[PDB]
Curated annotation (Swiss-Prot), chain A:
Protein name according to UniProt: Z-DNA-binding protein 1
Superkingdom, taxonomy of origin: Eukaryota
Tissue-wise expression: Highly expressed in lymphatic tissues including lymph node, leukocytes, tonsil, bone marrow and spleen. Expressed to a lesser extent in thymus, lung and liver.
Location in or out of the cell: Cytoplasm; Nucleus
Residues of the full protein shown: 103 to 165 of 429
Domain called Z-binding: residue spans: 2-64
Amino acid sequence: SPQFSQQREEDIYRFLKDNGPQRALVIAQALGMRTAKDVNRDLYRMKSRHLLDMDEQSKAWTIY
Amino acid sequence: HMASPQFSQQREEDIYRFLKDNGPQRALVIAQALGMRTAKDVNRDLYRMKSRHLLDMDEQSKAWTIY
DNA sequence: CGCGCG
DNA sequence: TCGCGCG
């Protein structure tokens, strides 16, 4: 199973599981926030833990 | 008969005076010299002053100068 | 405008 | 590549 330190990481993961790959502004807005900056530190931390991947060209995030 | 340049903020006048006497210098140096902590404390102001042609930045050294 | 950086 | 100025 994926290991989440904060429940909000699961919220991101499930959003991407449910809706396919999306940019950080979409993850943020879907979860009640505004911009990529509201979630990017979480996304890159999750990427470092092989929870998510990002396509560097489209900037879309997806589950790992 | 007013002095030149005119600065809209004390911060801008302080940056300009620091660079006139010491410059060029990196943003991290300017931030510390004005009692702040990192480049993030002055970058918004430096690029705004650059857009008004009050300062320039050397791309190679990253040091800011009075224009 | 990508920015992940405390 | 800590470059980053971004609201």
